[PDB]
From a paper:
The biosynthesis and maintenance of base-J depends on the base-[name] ([name]) that has a thymidine hydroxylase domain and a J-DNA-binding domain (JDBD). [name] specifically recognizes base-J-containing double-stranded DNA (J-DNA) through a JDBD which has been structurally characterized. In the context of [name], JDBD recognizes base-J and then probably invokes a conformational change in [name] (25, 26), enabling the THD to initiate the biosynthesis of base-J on a thymine 13 base pairs downstream the complementary DNA strand (J + 13′ position).
Notably, the crystal structure of the JDBD had a missing loop of eight residues (529–537) between helices α4 and α5, including the Arg532 that is important for DNA binding. The B factors in the loop range between 53.5 and 125.2 (mean 91.6) compared with a mean of 65.3 for the JDBD structure excluding the five α-helices. There are no crystal contacts observed for this loop, and there are no substantial differences in crystal properties overall. Thus, it remains unclear why the 529–537 loop is ordered in the new structure and not in previous experiments. The final structure was validated using MolProbity and it belongs to the 100th percentile, with a Ramachandran Z-score of −0.98 ± 0.72. In this predicted model, JDBD shows a similar overall fold when compared with our new crystal structure, with a noticeable difference in the loop between the α4 and α5 helices, that we found ordered in the new JDBD crystal structure.
Residue numbers in the entry: 392 to 561
Write the structure that this text describes.
Protein backbone atom coordinates (compact mmCIF):
# COMPACT_ATOMS: atom_id res chain seq x y z
CA UNK A 1 0.00 0.00 0.00
CA UNK A 2 2.67 2.59 1.14
CA UNK A 3 4.95 1.05 -1.55
CA UNK A 4 2.22 1.48 -4.19
CA UNK A 5 1.70 5.16 -3.27
CA UNK A 6 5.50 5.92 -3.32
CA UNK A 7 5.87 4.05 -6.70
CA UNK A 8 2.98 6.27 -7.94
CA UNK A 9 4.85 9.42 -6.64
CA UNK A 10 7.92 8.67 -8.88
CA UNK A 11 5.50 8.08 -11.71
CA UNK A 12 2.98 10.89 -11.31
CA UNK A 13 4.51 12.17 -14.59
CA UNK A 14 3.08 9.15 -16.48
CA UNK A 15 -0.22 11.05 -16.78
CA UNK A 16 1.50 14.14 -18.26
CA UNK A 17 0.70 14.65 -21.97
CA UNK A 18 4.34 14.12 -23.01
CA UNK A 19 4.35 10.66 -21.41
CA UNK A 20 0.88 9.79 -22.69
CA UNK A 21 1.65 10.92 -26.23
CA UNK A 22 1.61 7.98 -28.71
CA UNK A 23 0.54 5.49 -26.00
CA UNK A 24 -3.19 6.36 -26.42
CA UNK A 25 -5.18 7.69 -29.38
CA UNK A 26 -4.73 11.40 -30.09
CA UNK A 27 -8.51 11.81 -29.58
CA UNK A 28 -8.38 10.31 -26.06
CA UNK A 29 -5.31 12.33 -25.21
CA UNK A 30 -7.15 15.56 -26.14
CA UNK A 31 -10.17 14.53 -24.02
CA UNK A 32 -7.80 13.91 -21.11
CA UNK A 33 -6.10 17.32 -21.54
CA UNK A 34 -9.46 19.20 -21.72
CA UNK A 35 -10.99 17.31 -18.78
CA UNK A 36 -7.91 17.79 -16.55
CA UNK A 37 -7.74 21.51 -17.34
CA UNK A 38 -11.53 21.95 -16.82
CA UNK A 39 -11.41 20.29 -13.35
CA UNK A 40 -8.34 22.24 -12.22
CA UNK A 41 -9.78 25.54 -13.38
CA UNK A 42 -12.91 24.90 -11.27
CA UNK A 43 -11.04 23.74 -8.17
CA UNK A 44 -8.91 26.86 -8.49
CA UNK A 45 -11.97 29.14 -8.76
CA UNK A 46 -13.67 27.54 -5.72
CA UNK A 47 -10.46 27.64 -3.67
CA UNK A 48 -9.84 31.31 -4.45
CA UNK A 49 -13.29 32.25 -3.07
CA UNK A 50 -12.97 30.09 0.07
CA UNK A 51 -9.52 31.55 0.66
CA UNK A 52 -10.73 35.14 0.35
CA UNK A 53 -13.15 34.40 3.16
CA UNK A 54 -10.70 32.49 5.42
CA UNK A 55 -7.01 33.04 4.44
CA UNK A 56 -5.85 30.54 7.20
CA UNK A 57 -7.87 27.50 6.05
CA UNK A 58 -6.07 24.37 4.94
CA UNK A 59 -9.06 22.17 4.07
CA UNK A 60 -10.89 22.21 0.69
CA UNK A 61 -14.61 21.69 1.29
CA UNK A 62 -15.79 19.64 -1.68
CA UNK A 63 -19.33 20.68 -2.70
CA UNK A 64 -21.52 17.70 -3.61
CA UNK A 65 -23.72 19.49 -6.12
CA UNK A 66 -21.21 21.70 -7.93
CA UNK A 67 -19.83 22.09 -11.44
CA UNK A 68 -16.43 21.07 -10.00
CA UNK A 69 -17.96 17.83 -8.69
CA UNK A 70 -19.48 17.13 -12.12
CA UNK A 71 -16.14 17.90 -13.82
CA UNK A 72 -14.39 15.48 -11.45
CA UNK A 73 -16.79 12.64 -12.38
CA UNK A 74 -16.11 13.30 -16.07
CA UNK A 75 -12.31 13.34 -15.41
CA UNK A 76 -12.64 9.97 -13.76
CA UNK A 77 -14.57 8.65 -16.77
CA UNK A 78 -11.82 9.93 -19.08
CA UNK A 79 -9.13 8.61 -16.69
CA UNK A 80 -10.57 5.11 -16.72
CA UNK A 81 -10.46 5.04 -20.52
CA UNK A 82 -6.83 6.28 -20.39
CA UNK A 83 -5.99 3.27 -18.20
CA UNK A 84 -7.65 0.90 -20.67
CA UNK A 85 -5.87 2.66 -23.58
CA UNK A 86 -2.47 2.23 -21.95
CA UNK A 87 -3.19 -1.43 -21.24
CA UNK A 88 -4.69 -2.05 -24.69
CA UNK A 89 -7.56 -3.96 -23.01
CA UNK A 90 -11.30 -3.57 -22.39
CA UNK A 91 -11.08 -4.91 -18.84
CA UNK A 92 -8.15 -4.44 -16.46
CA UNK A 93 -6.96 -6.91 -13.83
CA UNK A 94 -8.01 -5.62 -10.36
CA UNK A 95 -4.30 -5.06 -9.42
CA UNK A 96 -3.82 -2.94 -12.59
CA UNK A 97 -6.87 -0.79 -11.77
CA UNK A 98 -5.60 -0.42 -8.18
CA UNK A 99 -2.18 0.83 -9.33
CA UNK A 100 -3.75 3.15 -11.87
CA UNK A 101 -6.15 4.85 -9.42
CA UNK A 102 -3.26 5.45 -7.03
CA UNK A 103 -1.27 7.10 -9.85
CA UNK A 104 -4.34 9.14 -10.81
CA UNK A 105 -4.98 10.45 -7.27
CA UNK A 106 -1.28 11.20 -6.75
CA UNK A 107 -1.06 13.03 -10.11
CA UNK A 108 -4.16 15.24 -9.38
CA UNK A 109 -3.17 15.93 -5.79
CA UNK A 110 0.26 16.96 -7.04
CA UNK A 111 -1.38 19.28 -9.60
CA UNK A 112 -3.45 21.04 -6.88
CA UNK A 113 -0.31 21.66 -4.82
CA UNK A 114 2.06 22.53 -7.73
CA UNK A 115 -0.20 24.14 -10.36
CA UNK A 116 -2.95 25.76 -8.22
CA UNK A 117 -0.52 26.36 -5.24
CA UNK A 118 -2.97 24.99 -2.68
CA UNK A 119 -1.83 23.56 0.69
CA UNK A 120 -0.79 19.95 0.18
CA UNK A 121 -3.26 18.75 2.78
CA UNK A 122 -6.22 20.60 1.13
CA UNK A 123 -6.70 18.15 -1.75
CA UNK A 124 -5.24 15.00 -0.14
CA UNK A 125 -5.05 11.53 -1.54
CA UNK A 126 -7.69 10.53 0.95
CA UNK A 127 -10.19 13.13 -0.24
CA UNK A 128 -9.70 12.21 -3.91
CA UNK A 129 -10.00 8.52 -2.95
CA UNK A 130 -13.37 9.00 -1.31
CA UNK A 131 -14.71 10.57 -4.47
CA UNK A 132 -12.99 7.94 -6.64
CA UNK A 133 -14.61 5.12 -4.67
CA UNK A 134 -18.01 6.68 -5.35
CA UNK A 135 -17.22 6.94 -9.08
CA UNK A 136 -16.07 3.28 -9.23
CA UNK A 137 -19.41 2.23 -7.66
CA UNK A 138 -21.29 4.35 -10.29
CA UNK A 139 -23.24 7.53 -11.10
CA UNK A 140 -26.38 6.69 -9.00
CA UNK A 141 -24.12 6.36 -5.90
CA UNK A 142 -21.84 9.31 -6.78
CA UNK A 143 -24.74 11.76 -7.59
CA UNK A 144 -27.20 10.46 -4.97
CA UNK A 145 -30.20 12.02 -6.77
CA UNK A 146 -29.61 11.83 -10.53
CA UNK A 147 -32.64 12.47 -12.83
CA UNK A 148 -33.05 9.57 -15.31
CA UNK A 149 -32.15 11.86 -18.25
CA UNK A 150 -28.84 12.82 -16.70
CA UNK A 151 -28.01 9.12 -16.36
CA UNK A 152 -28.48 8.72 -20.13
CA UNK A 153 -26.23 11.72 -20.78
CA UNK A 154 -23.49 10.21 -18.62
CA UNK A 155 -23.81 6.87 -20.45
CA UNK A 156 -23.61 8.59 -23.83
CA UNK A 157 -20.53 10.53 -22.73
CA UNK A 158 -18.82 7.31 -21.55
CA UNK A 159 -19.63 5.68 -24.90
CA UNK A 160 -18.04 8.58 -26.76
CA UNK A 161 -14.84 8.35 -24.60
CA UNK A 162 -14.66 4.60 -25.22
CA UNK A 163 -14.98 5.11 -29.00
CA UNK A 164 -12.21 7.73 -28.77
CA UNK A 165 -9.99 5.26 -26.95
CA UNK A 166 -10.56 2.74 -29.79
CA UNK A 167 -9.42 5.35 -32.41
CA UNK A 168 -13.04 5.90 -33.39
CA UNK A 169 -13.94 2.17 -33.56
CA UNK A 170 -16.86 0.48 -31.68
Amino acid sequence: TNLMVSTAVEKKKYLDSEFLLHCISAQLLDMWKQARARWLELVGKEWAHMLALNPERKDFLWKNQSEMNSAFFDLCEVGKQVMLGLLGKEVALPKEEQAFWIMYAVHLSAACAEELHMPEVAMSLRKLNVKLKDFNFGGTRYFKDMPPEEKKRRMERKQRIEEARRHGMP
